[PDB]
Design a protein around this ligand. Structure first.
Ligand SMILES: O=C(NCCCNc1nc(Nc2cccc(NC(=O)N3CCCC3)c2)ncc1I)c1cccs1
Ligand SMILES: O=C(NCCCNc1nc(Nc2cccc(NC(=O)N3CCCC3)c2)ncc1I)c1cccs1
Lengths: 379, 384
């Protein structure tokens, strides 16, 4: 069948998404023919507590960002009178289907990954500025939109398990007397969450970088659930992935990106610390947000100088800040090349290149994979 | 100063209750003049997420029981149009004020206590049947109402911190796929963690409440009292050896005196204490894997409520004894309970009732024993 509102119309066979509590359909405005995604809650859904039901509406009401799938309106279904959500339609689908593309079997292209990095981060920041916590971030609900400039824009959606956090202050005054409180209640209301998203993002970022999941059972994630729980909960600090090659074999843990990572070493080495800190179940040790945004911004504010090592026959991306000196450039070159700065001899556009030790990165000549700054070691 | 709605009117001076997010006032209905309690929220309270604000209302919409303060209507205040709660008014007040009665300084009388036990369990069962957790139960919240027989009825109220908890079991794959879920989320995604947790916090509060009612004292007492010294309070509640039902700080910065038993000054029969302490001990456990479930709690407490009393008097020590026994319990178990309180070996146990040696058949049921009273009790002497 079909359903509608006074402004929109959709067919139930036009499913875009299915979940425990709701479906999302592709609909059209009755007068313009403009496309929208309509989220409609199911009967099961109405058995949850009313205040829980109210959460998503309240969360989406708070958000308006380029990296959050846009809420256009809340309308009433003509027959049921049930409130539905009218949202931005993203005909390209999600980071899920992108990752299904073969060309992306060992990770997104470096530029597209950086896009993912920028947009997911921008979305998180927005959730954080609004006291929101999503709790179920996955490639499947990070939607892709081809922007004005032909470039992808990513946008978060599916805030079904989301909720607003509050500072404790409103709760505490709430209990007058403490003599009857449970220890936990006491701890919470007398003496004195969000990091769950950071974990999901960490895993999402891992998947985008490698085409693989960081933690997986030998049998695969869906089938071995016991194993999975031990892996993520028994994870050595600093580790980024743990895999089981054995039927009931031990977990091979790693602190670095796998060898087939689609990203340059330049970026791998920046990305790793970020993952290691967010993929920390112990809330004590996981990064807080202000640090997460700061470290990722530090990745995104860098420019790239393309280097090619002629002695090693390898290509390199140097992630440097526009204000960084040449001294620093050479140091970043050594970090990947293992050619001491003293022995680094450069060549640009067929002629030898010499850099004042105090020149600035934004005044280096323009480089490209096709036209890089060559390095060689001169003993 | 005063406020109003279409139907009710209250004077700001007539405050019945006062808290962080709301006040409760005594009002009258504009036509009938019937008294009611009215809960009015403060502005600060509206800074909370709307869904949180909703809860108390959505809770009170679900509840209907004799042990839960009744909701009459949700109306709007005339000047602000904010929603207010029209509630059953309880002139008598709460279990808290009852316990402020001099005669209750060492606990309630067995008769009230048993009533308090029954009602609280009844209400807590209603909450549990509706997935609710109160979270802030205390004598101050437990309202007292005179029933038709002149007997007390107790009723829960003040659901300011309450919420209705989702049963995770009811749905399949609430979260679509798990590969990206934080471990806590994964747990909820595949494992009654939240419902089992929320449940216990009310059990604890109920424990402290019953201990208070039975003794006139709080079980966990820093030397300066709970309000004065929160670090110790916490250490005591957090550091309590299992089986312990109280911890008291006798002196300043002194060690703690732990007890697994009721204090000797307790106003309850030993018959009742022996039954109550294991209940107190298993709900006053901070340890999730050690504490009782709700089901045990209900089974164990109803075990107490569905026992009959047989009044015995021991000629040995000249003392009276309440013997808590099930209508289906046998003579065998009766002499057992008697010895536990009397120390008279079962065999030496010679009984006298209404001036005649009582010969209990070996297997007859405690339902077919003589009806006793504190005034007409079975006497028991040793035949040595
Ligand atoms: O939201 C959810 N899940 C997120 C998805 C559904 N929800 C929305 N979906 C779109 N757009 C969309 C959807 C599906 C497929 C596609 N297209 C493709 O996949 N293509 C086309 C080109 C290659 C493959 C686009 N917009 C806005 C929304 I809100 C939920 C699932 C269960 C409860 S909620
Ligand atoms: O709910 C709360 N606190 C619980 C109570 C307030 N709320 C209600 N209160 C009554 N009745 C009532 C109350 C207080 C006192 C009395 N009477 C006395 O104290 N007496 C009478 C004789 C001697 C002293 C009666 N009914 C229904 C309700 I809802 C809150 C405190 C802060 C926010 S909420």
């Amino acid at each position: 069948g079909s359903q509608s509102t006074s402004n929109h119309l959709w067919l139930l066979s036009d499913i875009l998404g299915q979940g425990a509590t709701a479906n999302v359909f592709r609909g059209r405005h009755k007068k313009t023919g403009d496309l929208f995604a309509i989220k409609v809650f199911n009967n099961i859904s109405f058995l949850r507590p009313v205040d829980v039901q109210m959460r998503e509406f309240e969360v989406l009401k708070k958000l308006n960002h380029k990296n959050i799938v846009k809420l256009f309106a809340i309308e009433e279904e003509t027959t049921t009178r049930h409130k539905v959500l009218i949202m931005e339609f993203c005909p390209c689908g999600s980071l899920y289907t992108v990752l299904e593309e073969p060309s992306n079997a060992y990770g997104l292209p470096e530029s597209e990954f950086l896009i993912v990095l920028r947009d997911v981060v921008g979305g998180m920041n927005h959730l954080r500025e609004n006291g929101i916590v999503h709790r179920n971030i996955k490639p499947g609900n990070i939607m892709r939109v081809i922007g004005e400039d032909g470039q992808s824009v990513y946008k978060l959606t599916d805030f079904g398990a989301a909720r607003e956090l509050e500072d404790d202050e409103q709760f505490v005054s709430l209990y007058g007397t403490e003599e009857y409180l449970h220890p936990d209640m006491y701890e919470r209301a007398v003496l004195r969450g969000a990091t769950v998203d950071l974990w999901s993002i960490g895993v999402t970022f891992y998947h985008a970088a490698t085409g693989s999941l960081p933690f997986r059972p030998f049998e695969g994630p869906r089938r071995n659930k016991e194993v999975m729980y031990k892996i993520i909960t028994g994870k050595p600090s600093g580790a980024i992935s743990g895999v089981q090659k054995a039927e009931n074999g031990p977990i091979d843990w790693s602190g670095d990106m796998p060898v087939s990572c689609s990203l340059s070493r330049g970026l791998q080495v920046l990305l790793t610390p970020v993952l290691a800190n967010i993929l920390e179940a112990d809330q004590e040790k996981c990064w807080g947000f202000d640090q997460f945004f700061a470290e990722t911004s530090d990745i995104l504010h860098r420019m790239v100088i393309h280097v090619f090592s002629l002695q090693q026959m390898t290509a390199h991306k140097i992630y440097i800040h526009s204000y960084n000196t040449a001294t620093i450039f050479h140091e970043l070159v050594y970090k990947q090349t293992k050619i001491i700065s003293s022995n680094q001899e450069l060549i640009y556009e067929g002629r030898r290149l010499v850099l004042e030790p105090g020149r600035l990165a934004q005044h280096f000549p323009k480089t490209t994979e096709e036209n890089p700054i060559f390095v060689v070691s001169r003993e």
